[PDB]
Amino acid sequence: PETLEARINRATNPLNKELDWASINGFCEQLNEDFEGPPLATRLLAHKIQSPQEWEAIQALTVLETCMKSCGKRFHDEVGKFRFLNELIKVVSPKYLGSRTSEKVKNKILELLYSWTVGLPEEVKIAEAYQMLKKQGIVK
Amino acid sequence: DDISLLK
């Protein structure tokens, strides 16, 4: 089948007129079966989420959201590592990309993080990262 | 292994 990259470029393609739920699903599926899967997938979303093109970032976030909802224990491991949390922080923090980032994209990320501190207490690093955004005042 | 929390 198509590689993870090909799957993500379609799932987050700036030309999509609507969410490509098909290709998206295919993404969460494929990544959760390769040993190198999660780390790769995780690195790709990070880049997509930081795109200057909002629609490309919004879809990426939707993909991240989706794969996190499946019983993908492996995906939660990668997303739970600061190796990935830092990338989301760079997008919402003013000290980095936070300034040039759309309000829409930043608010979505904050909500995504919250929801995980709730349905995924098992992941402390997420709560840890989320907590820092609180102190900085990012979390109004 | 994992990097530290960004500042």
Method of determination? X-ray
CA nearest to A51, candidates A102, A107, A115 = A102
CA distances from A121 to A32, A117, A125, A127 (A): 21, 5, 9, 7
CA–CA gap between residue A78 and residue A62 (Å, rounded): 17
Inform me whether the C-beta atom of residue A136 falls under 8 Å from chain B C-beta atoms: no
A1, A111, A125 from A62: Cα distances, Å: 22, 12, 21
What is the number of residues in chain A?
140
**Which chain A residue shows the shortest CA-CA distance from B6?**
A86
DSSP label at A50?
A: T
Nearest to A125 by CA among A91, A96, A84, A95: A84
Min Cα distance A11 → chain B (Å) is: 27
Spatial separation of the C-alpha atoms in residues A97 and A101, rounded to whole Å? 6
> Which domains, and CATH codes, for chain A?
1-140 (1.25.40.90)
Q: In angstroms, rounded to a whole number, what is the distance separating the alpha carbons of residues A115 and A39?
A: 22
Report the C-alpha gap between A107 and A83 in whole angstroms.
21
Q: Nearest-CA distance from A115 to chain B in Å?
A: 19
What DSSP string describes A71-97?
Answer: S-HHHHHHHHSHHHHHHHHHHH-TTTT
Helix H or strand E segment including A104: helix A103-119
Resolution (Å units)? 2.6
| B3·A86 Cβ contact <8 A | yes
Q: Are A93 and A87 in contact (CB under 8 A)?
A: no
DSSP, collapsed to helix, strand or coil, labels residue A125 as helix
Gap between the Cα atoms of A96 and A2, Å rounded: 34
Residue A36, classed as helix, strand or coil, is coil
